[PDB]
Design a protein around this nucleic acid. Structure first.
Lengths: 63, 81, 122
RNA sequence: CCCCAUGAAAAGGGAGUCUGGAACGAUCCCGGGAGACCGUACCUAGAACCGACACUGGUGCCCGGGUGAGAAGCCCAAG
RNA sequence: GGUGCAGAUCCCGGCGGUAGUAACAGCGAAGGGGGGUGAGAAUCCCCCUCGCCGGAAGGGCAAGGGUUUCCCGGCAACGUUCGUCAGCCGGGAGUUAGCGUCCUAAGGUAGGGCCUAAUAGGUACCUACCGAAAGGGAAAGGGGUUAACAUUCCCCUGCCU
RNA sequence: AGCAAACUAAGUACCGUGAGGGAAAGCUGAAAAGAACCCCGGAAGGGGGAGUGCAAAGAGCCUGAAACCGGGUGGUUAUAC
RNA sequence: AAGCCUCCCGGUGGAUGGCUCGGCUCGGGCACCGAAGAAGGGCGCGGCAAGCAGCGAAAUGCUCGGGUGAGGCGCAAGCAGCCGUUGACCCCGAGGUCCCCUAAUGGGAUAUCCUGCCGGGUUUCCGGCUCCCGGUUUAUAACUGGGUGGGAACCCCCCGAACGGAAACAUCUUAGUAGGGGGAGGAAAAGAAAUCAAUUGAGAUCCCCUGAGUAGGGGCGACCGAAAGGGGGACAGCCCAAACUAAACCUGCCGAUGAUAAGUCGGUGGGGAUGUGGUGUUACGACCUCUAGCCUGAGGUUGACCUCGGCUUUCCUAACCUAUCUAGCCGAACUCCCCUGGAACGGGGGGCCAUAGAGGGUGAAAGCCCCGUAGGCUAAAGAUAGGUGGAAAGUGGCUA
């Protein structure tokens, strides 16, 4: 999943938990430190890259 | 902010033996409460926490739960068991 | 104005930045290609086919299946040298000794690059 | 008992006395709540420190019986 | 034209001979038998016995080293021999405190000022602060549990602010 | 040699309590085609045999001298430099 | 029996020979960064991640445009997986984030770490806290608003060495160099003569070549050592104090206007007669004032005078246009025949472009196989330069 534009579309209140809900499942992927043996290594990069974006898009809304 | 759920052979007993959790967080070098982090992320009361400074560069904390919250469940919800 | 010392020149081709790699891929088309396209040389893309003029296997026609963009050489199917085990590995032949035979008109973004080269109408 | 040597100072505590204040009110007990951050593994040296080394050199510190004044020597306890 | 080399107790790299020679003694330790593992055993492991130390080769504690701790698998070197073994190599794990931080001596500093041409210079004066893991300094122990650390985790008794 | 530096990190490892001093080290062929496979050993890019490839001096990989040492070729020795 | 010598073969070392994404010199361009947090370090950061490099908890890259155009996921080939045609990766520009120490400045440091006080919203958290300049409020309380360090060499200015040389050595010299301290910028310094020289001349300074080891200095010892003039380069020259005008003055904020600029306007606060602003600073004089005389387009006044014109100086940069720089792009001619060769980029034959035969690559020594080359072309968005714009002040000339 690569969300790119709808972040700019709608309100900022929801993206807080949208950040949170992503943040939680980041932990879920973070079980790999035990050799989680999770299939999608790129998910972390997918997770890590996108999480910053919404954490960046908020500035465009002059937070 | 919470970063990972450690799963060493040492840890697994603790979540069973004492219903604790081995969680390592940022090295924020300032804490009053790693406590109130969990419940807004897991809805669990806290009974005690402590401080660890591992030589590998992380900051470990033994957090134990009151008996009303069986720590194995949330871990199973997380998904290592 | 660019220098002519051998050393500096070789540095570019050993350090080719990514958006310039087409340079070591472009190969000569055929007459029939330029007959309806009005163009001499163009960069290679996948999904194409080529013919060969130099090397021990001169005179082959295959399909553009493999490529080495960073250093600039390609490969075509139906042409392999068996390893000791018996699995095939792709023969590596440079664009420098090849002639293209056909291209893929299914991109609409490679197409306009063809167009902008002053080729006549369509 | 000795001194032509007279043998450290703060913070921190506790008490005493006098002034002002409000009447509620504890240095009592009873119930409740909390108590940053960081040190914390191992080795202390005839192999873990230094002396270029798995070095008879130095750097430490402290602590069973009998025989025997004995921490002397001997042997044997713990190890 | 950096220009022709045997040296300069030349420099650097390689390898000679003395050569399998010295040494692997000397400071009061010492092993033996049987079994096991593994290719390979004086050297590693199991059993028994035996000798030595025993105000130290024992026990617990620093500054320092920084993983030297533990588990699992290994031996080309690394070990003064060997080596299945190790502080060695390779794959993983591991220190929790309501029961140092505070103050201060030797002194020191930083500033204000007294000089120095200037200063990263000295500074008698004043002010602010640093200065002890053996100085002083509130308060807990007991038992019990992991291979690995514990007055810290489990239980009881507490205790101090 | 070229500035120390062309290399997996060079002011890096390191020697020094300290100001500081200060290294060594390039080349497989074009394409790893890196010897599948069979025998020895436990193993070692180790042996042998096969195979790739113009060529294998095929990982310690261009070419490969001497000091050296070993096998052999040719002379040649225990009354003697 | 040792061997001995030489030679063939092998291993042991790697010089030779060859190759080079490296340095080295030159010339030419370019040539400050910093409290909005530097340079310099310390830490982290990827699926499996050690160093470098890059990156800053928004950690192998976040956003937006511009170019680019089919693969990308560094150094660096593995397992596994993903991004990419809804335009990737890359490159350009604009942003966003941007930990800790660090001149580090809330306070403290033998801790790259701990720790307060206010104000803000408030969950995370955010702003401010040595020495000064000018303001608020009491005349000491806090509060409004803006000099520190680094940078390869270079530059300026103070302090200031011995070694040696004199075949000794003490004066002298080596020498204001080595070095110390302060302080800048991209250049610095200096810069308008109390200059020279000499037959009445030249005309800021600086550097280059000469003048010239000349002048001149010193146990007259080693040695040191000009100027003037000439010849070259670019050659630019304006403000202050005074005489004399005398509040006609400068400046903070807010609001309006003005393109947001400057300026003007209304209110505001400050500074100022112990002097702001106006003209003006030069030598056989200059300048100012007064007197007298002659001398501007409109108006007025009494040949004469005055007010409003153009002009000089200064300040302000905007939207637009032009050019230049950051980017990619166009860009000729054979892979024709025979032979050798693993490969033709070789040998022979054959044909051609050239304003492009610098150069590099591709299985070798290729103008015509590929790039590039001579020549020409590219902009959203920025940056630079010029024009196009606006405003303020000071305003006759000559003569005695």
């Amino acid at each position: 999943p690569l969300e790119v534009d709808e972040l700019r579309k709608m309100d900022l209140k929801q993206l807080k938990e949208r950040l949170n809900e992503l943040e939680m499942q980041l932990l879920k992927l973070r079980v790999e430190s035990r050799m989680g043996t999770l299939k999608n290594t790129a998910s972390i990069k997918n997770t890590r890259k996108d999480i910053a974006r919404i954490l960046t898009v908020i500035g465009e809304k002059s937070k | 902010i919470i970063k990972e759920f450690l799963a060493t052979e040492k840890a697994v007993k603790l979540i069973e033996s004492q219903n604790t959790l081995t969680i390592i967080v940022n090295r924020n070098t300032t804490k009053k409460d790693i406590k109130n982090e969990v419940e807004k992320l897991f809805s669990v009361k806290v009974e005690k926490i402590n401080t660890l400074i591992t030589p590998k560069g992380e900051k470990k904390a033994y957090v134990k739960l009151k008996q009303e919250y069986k720590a194995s469940d949330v871990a199973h919800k997380l998904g290592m068991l | 104005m660019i220098s002519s010392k051998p050393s500096k020149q070789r540095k570019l081709v050993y350090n080719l930045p990514n958006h310039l790699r087409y340079k070591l891929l472009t190969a000569r088309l055929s007459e029939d290609l330029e007959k309806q396209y009005g163009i001499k040389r163009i960069s290679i893309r996948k999904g194409d086919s080529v013919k060969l003029m130099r090397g021990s296997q001169v005179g082959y026609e295959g399909k553009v299946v493999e490529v080495d963009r960073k250093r600039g050489r390609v490969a075509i199917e139906g042409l392999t040298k068996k390893k000791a085990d018996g699995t095939p590995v792709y023969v590596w032949v440079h664009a420098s000794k090849v002639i293209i035979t056909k291209l893929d008109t299914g991109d609409k973004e490679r197409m306009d690059a063809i167009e902008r080269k002053r080729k006549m109408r369509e």
